[PDB]
C-alpha cells in the first residue's frame, strides 16, 4: 500500500495548486480563513482479529457540515469544489493504512 | 473507540490546504489549542515543531493521528522515533515538492527490519 | 526526412526510396493521400529508437522486412492469406442494409 | 470622430499595438503541445515575452505563484506607465478599471475579521495596482461590517461602494462574500455607464461586450457557489447577480428568482448565447475561451482606447494558461492543455 | 569567434580534410589560401594536433559528442559566471589573465602547442574517464567558489547591518561612550534613572513634564547627555515600585524609552564585531581573488580541449579515413566574422555536401522556431561548417 499511495496521494495533491491562479490570488490564505471546524472524523473500531481487539480507523467524511463557510469567489469555483471532492478522498486510504499501522 | 478524533498536521501551508479543506480539526477558541499546525518548509525553526509534535503526541490522547511531512519527519526524526505509540497514530506524509522517500518514514523504517 | 538524415548520421547514409504509384487513403487528415516509403541501412543499432520515434511521431507503418528476396516470397505468401477474403466485407454488408 | 480621435493621441495606441503584438500566438502554442515537462516550459519561458524573468529569478520546479507575480509585474509596470502618459479622461479610464482590482482590494480589508491579516499580505495577495500607498481602515474594529464607513470615508469609492449596511450586513458568513459581489456589481454597473458616456463608440462596444460578458458569468459562478453551499435569497441573489447583464439584463433576474438547477437551466437556455451548463467539466476555462474571443474584438477596431483593456486581458489570461499547463504538467495531466486560450 | 572583448583577438575552429583542394585556387595550401585570402595585421592561423587513446564503438560515439556538447555548455556558462564574478568585484574591471600572460605564458602561446599533456593527471586516459575528472573538479571549484561568495556577501550585509544603527531614533541608540554612570544611580532600588528619549520638536512639551506632575525626579539633572540634531536623551528617575504606571504616562505623550544595562562586555562585543566584519570580508575578497585566479586558469585548458576531442572525433565519423587528418586552429583579431565565414563555407561546403544547392543551413537548439529548428532530432538543417564560439 505504502508505494503506491506515494504516487496516488500526490496525483491529487497538486490540483490545489492551479486553483491558485485559476482564481487569480494565492488561495492558501482564504482557504485557511475559511476553516473553523472539522468535517472528517475517525472511529477507532475495535476489530477482535484472531482474539485480539485492534484499533481499525473508520474513514468517514461529514458531507452536511462544511469548513467555516467561504466557498468560491466567481472565477474558481468549479475547480474547488471538485478539488474538496477528490484530494478529501485522498484521505480514507490514509485512514487505512493508519489502521494498517496499528 | 473514539477517545481521539483530531488529526494532527505538522506540514506546509500548501499541503495543509487541502487537509484542512476536507477537514483535520479546527482551533480550539478557548485557548488557540488548534488541531494542527502551520508550518514554512526549510525557512522556519524546528524548535516550535517540537514543541507542537510534545502537545500533540504526550500533551493531546485527543489526536487521532499526527500527519507530518517526510521533510519535517526527517527535520525531527529523533522526536519522530522518540514518541512511538499507536493510538497516537503516527502516518508521515511525502512532503508536498519532496517525492516518495520510504526512508523517510520511521515506522516504515521498522517495516524494514525484522523481515 | 532526408535533410534530417543528413544531420542525424552526421555525413553516412545509404538511402533508396521511390514514389508510391496509386496514392492512398488516411484518417488522421482523412484524405487520399499522397505517401511514400523508405529504405536505409546503417550500423547504428540502439539509435534506431530515435530513427523509429521520429518516424511514427511524423508518420511511419511498422515493416518487419528481408535484406534479401527469400523471405520476399514469405511474406507475398502471410500477406495473400488475408489478401484473398478482405474484399468480401463490403459486398457482404450491402445487401443487408439494403434489404 | 475617426480621423479627429487622432489630434494628439497618435502613439499610444502605437506603443499599445507594440505590446500587443508581444502576445503569444498559435504559433507559439505549438510549442505549448510540445510542452510537457517543467523543463520545457522553462526553455520556453525563456524565449518569449515572458522570456527569461520566469526563469531568471525561479527555479527549475515553476511555482504558480511566483511566475504569475513574475508575469504580471511587467504588466503592472506597463500600465502604470500607460496610465502616466494618458491623458486626462483615459487616465480616469484607466483609474476604473484599476477599480475593480481595488474593490477587490478593500473587499479583503473588511472580509478579514478572524484572522486580521497584514496589509502588505492582502496587497500580495491581489493586484498591486489596487493599493496606493497605505490604508488606515484596520485601525478601527474589523469586525464583519464595521469599516465600510471606514473605508468609504478613507477610498474614494463612495459610488462603488454600494450601500453593505442595508442587506449585506448581517453578522453572518454570506457577508464575507455578499460584500464582494454587491460591490462588484456596483463597480461593473459604473464602468458600464462610464464607458456608456465616455469612451466614444468603438471603444463604447469594445468595452460593453466583454464587460457584460464577464458580468453575466460572475453572476453564473456566484450563483454555483450559492448553489455549492447554503443557498440564498432571491432578492439577495440579485443584489449579487448583477442586475444589468450588459447583453441581456432580462435572463439574470431569471436566475436570481431561480433557485434550482433547473430554473437556472431555462434562464439561461433563453439567453441565445453560450450555455455554460450541460457542457462544461471546467466551466471557467470554456469562459475564458470566449472572453478572450470577445475581446478579440477590440483589437479588431483600429480606433478605439479599448486596445489597452484587450491587451491587458489577453496578457492576464496568457499568464493563466501558461500557469495552467505548467501545473497540469506537475499533475501530468495533458488532456487539460488545450484549454489555453487560441484566438491571438 | 569573441567570448570576452578587452583587447583580445577572436579564435574559431574548423575541419582540415587533407584529400581535396580549395574550390577556387587547386595550387594552394590553407595557409598560402589564408594569408593570400585575408588581409594583413589578421591573416595569421596556428596549428593543432592530438591523438586518439580511447574511441568508443561507432554507435555511442553520437552520445558521446551530445554529452559532450551538455558539458561544453555547462562549463562555458560556468566559466562566464566566474569571469562575470570576479569583475564584480571591480577590483579590476578588465581582462584577468584573458590578456594578462596566461599561466605566465603569451595568451595565444599556451594553447597552440598545448597538446594534453600531463599537468596534473595523466595524459591519456578514456573519453568517459575525462568527462567524468573534468566535471567534478569544475563543480568542486565551482561550489567552492559560490559559498565563497556567498560568505563574501554575508559580510557585507553584516557591514550594512552594522552602519545602520549608526542612524536613527534613540529607542536602541548607542549610549556607551557619551553616557556617565554617575548620572546613572544603580547601587539600589531607590532612584532608578530611566532614559526616555523625544524628538527635537517637544522641548518645551518635555522639560516641564517632570518638575511640575512626577513624584521625586531628582531634581539638576533631567536633561540631554547627547543630542543628535533630531532626538534627545533624558535622565530621569522614579520609585522601584511605579515604574509602569510612569511609563505608561510617558508613551501616552509617546515618548520612546531607552531600557539599557551598562555592561563593558557589549561596547567590547561592539568593537570586535566591526573589526571581525571588515578584517574577514577583506581578507575573504583577496583570498578568492587567488582561488578564482587558480579555478580559472586550471579549466582554461579543458574548456576547449573538450572541443578539440569533440572535433577530433565528429570529423573521422563524418568523413573519410578512421585514424587522422589535417587539422588545425584559427587565430584572428575581430570584427570579421562573417567576413572569414563566407569564404570559410566557400572553401569546404562543396565537398561537406556532394548532391545539394541550398540556402538554409546552421546548428541552434532553441525552442522559437518548430521547423527549421536545427536540432538534429527535430527538424535539423544541413552544417558542414564547424565553427566555435572560442577567444582571448
Redesign the interface.
Known amino acids: 500500500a505504502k508505494q503506491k499511495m506515494g504516487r496516488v496521494m500526490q496525483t491529487a495533491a497538486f490540483s490545489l495548486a492551479e486553483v491558485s491562479y485559476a482564481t487569480g490570488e494565492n488561495i492558501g490564505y482564504q482557504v485557511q480563513e475559511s476553516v473553523s471546524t472539522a468535517r472528517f472524523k475517525v472511529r477507532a473500531r475495535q476489530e477482535n482479529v484472531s482474539g485480539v481487539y485492534l484499533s481499525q480507523f473508520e474513514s468517514y467524511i461529514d458531507p452536511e457540515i462544511n469548513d467555516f463557510r467561504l466557498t468560491g469567489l466567481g472565477r474558481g469555483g468549479q475547480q474547488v469544489q471538485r478539488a474538496k471532492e477528490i484530494y478529501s478522498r485522498a484521505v480514507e486510504t490514509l485512514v487505512e493504512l493508519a489502521s494498517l499501522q496499528t | 473507540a473514539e477517545k481521539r478524533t483530531l488529526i494532527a498536521v505538522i506540514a506546509d501551508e500548501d499541503t495543509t490546504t487541502g487537509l484542512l479543506l476536507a477537514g483535520i480539526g479546527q482551533i480550539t477558541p478557548e485557548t488557540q489549542e488548534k488541531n494542527f499546525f502551520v508550518y514554512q518548509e526549510g525557512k522556519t525553526t524546528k524548535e516550535e515543531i517540537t514543541d507542537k509534535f510534545n502537545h500533540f503526541t504526550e500533551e493531546r490522547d485527543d489526536i487521532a493521528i499526527l500527519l507530518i511531512n517526510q521533510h519535517i519527519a526527517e527535520n525531527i526524526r529523533a522526536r519522530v522515533d522518540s514518541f512511538t505509540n499507536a493510538f497516537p497514530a503516527i502516518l508521515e506524509i511525502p512532503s508536498k515538492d519532496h517525492p516518495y522517500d520510504p526512508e523517510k518514514d520511521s515506522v516504515l523504517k521498522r517495516v524494514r527490519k525484522l523481515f | 526526412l532526408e535533410q534530417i538524415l543528413w544531420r542525424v548520421l552526421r555525413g553516412n547514409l545509404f538511402f533508396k526510396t521511390v514514389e508510391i504509384e496509386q496514392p492512398v487513403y488516411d484518417v488522421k487528415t482523412r484524405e487520399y493521400k499522397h505517401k511514400n516509403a523508405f529504405i536505409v541501412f546503417s550500423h547504428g543499432d540502439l539509435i534506431i529508437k530515435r530513427i523509429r520515434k521520429i518516424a511514427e511521431s511524423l508518420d511511419a507503418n511498422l515493416y518487419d522486412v528481408d535484406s534479401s528476396n527469400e523471405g520476399r516470397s514469405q511474406q507475398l505468401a502471410k500477406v495473400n492469406k488475408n489478401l484473398s477474403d478482405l474484399y468480401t466485407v463490403l459486398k457482404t454488408t450491402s445487401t443487408t442494409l439494403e434489404s | 470622430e475617426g480621423v479627429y480621435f487622432n489630434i494628439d493621441n497618435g502613439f499610444i495606441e502605437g506603443v499599445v499595438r507594440g505590446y500587443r503584438n508581444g502576445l503569444l500566438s498559435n504559433?507559439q502554442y505549438?510549442?505549448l503541445t510540445?510542452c510537457d515537462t517543467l523543463e520545457?516550459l522553462k526553455?520556453?519561458l525563456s524565449?518569449t515575452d515572458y522570456g527569461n524573468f520566469l526563469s531568471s529569478v525561479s527555479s527549475e520546479?515553476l511555482?504558480?505563484?511566483l511566475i504569475?507575480e513574475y508575469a504580471s509585474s511587467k504588466l503592472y509596470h506597463e500600465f502604470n506607465y500607460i496610465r502616466d502618459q494618458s491623458s486626462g479622461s483615459t487616465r480616469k479610464f484607466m483609474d476604473y478599471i484599476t477599480y475593480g482590482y481595488m474593490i477587490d482590494n478593500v473587499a479583503l480589508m473588511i472580509?478579514?475579521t478572524?484572522?486580521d491579516?497584514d496589509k502588505g499580505?492582502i496587497l500580495?495577495?491581489?493586484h498591486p495596482l489596487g493599493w496606493f500607498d497605505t490604508l488606515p481602515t484596520l485601525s478601527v474594529a474589523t469586525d464583519l461590517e464595521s469599516l465600510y464607513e471606514t473605508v468609504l470615508v478613507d477610498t474614494p469609492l463612495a459610488p462603488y461602494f454600494k450601500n453593505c449596511f442595508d442587506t449585506a450586513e448581517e453578522l453572518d458568513?454570506?457577508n464575507?462574500?455578499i460584500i464582494?459581489?454587491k460591490l462588484?456589481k456596483a463597480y461593473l454597473e459604473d464602468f458600464y455607464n462610464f464607458v456608456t458616456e465616455e469612451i466614444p463608440e468603438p471603444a463604447k462596444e469594445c468595452m460593453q461586450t466583454l464587460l457584460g460578458f464577464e458580468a453575466d458569468?460572475?453572476s453564473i459562478?456566484?450563483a454555483?457557489?450559492?448553489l455549492?453551499?447554503?443557498d440564498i435569497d432571491p432578492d439577495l441573489k440579485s443584489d449579487l447577480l448583477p442586475n444589468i447583464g450588459k447583453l441581456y439584463p432580462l435572463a439574470t433576474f431569471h436566475l436570481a428568482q431561480a433557485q434550482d438547477f433547473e430554473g437556472v437551466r431555462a434562464a439561461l437556455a433563453n439567453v441565445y448565447e453560450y450555455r455554460g451548463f450541460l457542457e462544461?467539466?471546467?466551466?471557467?476555462d470554456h469562459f475564458y475561451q470566449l472572453e478572450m474571443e470577445l475581446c478579440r474584438d477590440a483589437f479588431t477596431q483600429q480606433f478605439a482606447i479599448s486596445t489597452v483593456w484587450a491587451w491587458m486581458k489577453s496578457k492576464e489570461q496568457e499568464?493563466?494558461n501558461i500557469?495552467?499547463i505548467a501545473?497540469?504538467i506537475?499533475?501530468?495531466q495533458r488532456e487539460r492543455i488545450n484549454n489555453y486560450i487560441s484566438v491571438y | 569567434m569573441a567570448t570576452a572583448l578587452y583587447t583580445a583577438n577572436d579564435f574559431i575552429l574548423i575541419s582540415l580534410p587533407q584529400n581535396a583542394q580549395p574550390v577556387t585556387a587547386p595550387g594552394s595550401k590553407t595557409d598560402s589560401w589564408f594569408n593570400e585570402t585575408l588581409i594583413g595585421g589578421r591573416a595569421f592561423v596556428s596549428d593543432f594536433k592530438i591523438p586518439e587513446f580511447k574511441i568508443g564503438s561507432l554507435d555511442t560515439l553520437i552520445v558521446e559528442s551530445e554529452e559532450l556538447s551538455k558539458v561544453d555548455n555547462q562549463i562555458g556558462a560556468s566559466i562566464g559566471k566566474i569571469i562575470e564574478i570576479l569583475q564584480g568585484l571591480n577590483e579590476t574591471s578588465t581582462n584577468a589573465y584573458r590578456t594578462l600572460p596566461i599561466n605566465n605564458m603569451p595568451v595565444p602561446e599556451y594553447l597552440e602547442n598545448f597538446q594534453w599533456q600531463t599537468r596534473k593527471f595523466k595524459l591519456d586516459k578514456s573519453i568517459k574517464d575525462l568527462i567524468t575528472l573534468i566535471s567534478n573538479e569544475s563543480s568542486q571549484l565551482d561550489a567552492d567558489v559560490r559559498a565563497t561568495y556567498a560568505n563574501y556577501n554575508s559580510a557585507k550585509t553584516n557591514l550594512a547591518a552594522a552602519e545602520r544603527k549608526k542612524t536613527g531614533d534613540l529607542s536602541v541608540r548607542s549610549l556607551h561612550d557619551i553616557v556617565k554612570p554617575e548620572d546613572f544611580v544603580l547601587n539600589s532600588e531607590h532612584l532608578t534613572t530611566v532614559l526616555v528619549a523625544v524628538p527635537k520638536s517637544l522641548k518645551s512639551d518635555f522639560e516641564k513634564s517632570y518638575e511640575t506632575l512626577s513624584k521625586n525626579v531628582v531634581p539638576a539633572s533631567a536633561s540631554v547627555i547627547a543630542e543628535d540634531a533630531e532626538y534627545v536623551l533624558f535622565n530621569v528617575h522614579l520609585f522601584k515600585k511605579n515604574v509602569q504606571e510612569f511609563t505608561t504616562a510617558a508613551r501616552e505623550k509617546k515618548f520612546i524609552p531607552r531600557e539599557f544595562n551598562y555592561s563593558e562586555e557589549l561596547i567590547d562585543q561592539l568593537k570586535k564585531e566591526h573589526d571581525s566584519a571588515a578584517s574577514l570580508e577583506q581578507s575573504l575578497r583577496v583570498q578568492l581573488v587567488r582561488l578564482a585566479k587558480t579555478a580559472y586558469v586550471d579549466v582554461f585548458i579543458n574548456w576547449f580541449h573538450i572541443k578539440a576531442l569533440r572535433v577530433y572525433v565528429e570529423s573521422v565519423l563524418r568523413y573519410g579515413l578512421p585514424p587522422h587528418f589535417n587539422i588545425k586552429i584559427i587565430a584572428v583579431p575581430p570584427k570579421n566574422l562573417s567576413k572569414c565565414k563566407s569564404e570559410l563555407i566557400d572553401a569546404f561546403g562543396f565537398l561537406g555536401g556532394n548532391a545539394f544547392m541550398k540556402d538554409k543551413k546552421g546548428k541552434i537548439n532553441k525552442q522559437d522556431t518548430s521547423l527549421h529548428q536545427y536540432a538534429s532530432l527535430v527538424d535539423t538543417e544541413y552544417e558542414p561548417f564547424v565553427m566555435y564560439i572560442i577567444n582571448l
Open positions: 504559433n505549438i510549442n510540445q520545457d526553455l520556453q524565449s520546479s511555482t504558480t505563484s504569475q472580509t478579514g478572524i484572522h491579516r499580505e500580495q495577495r491581489c458568513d454570506m464575507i462574500e464582494r459581489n462588484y458569468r460572475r459562478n456566484i454555483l457557489n450559492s455549492q453551499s447554503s462544461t467539466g471546467n466551466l471557467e499568464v493563466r500557469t495552467w501545473e497540469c506537475a499533475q501530468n
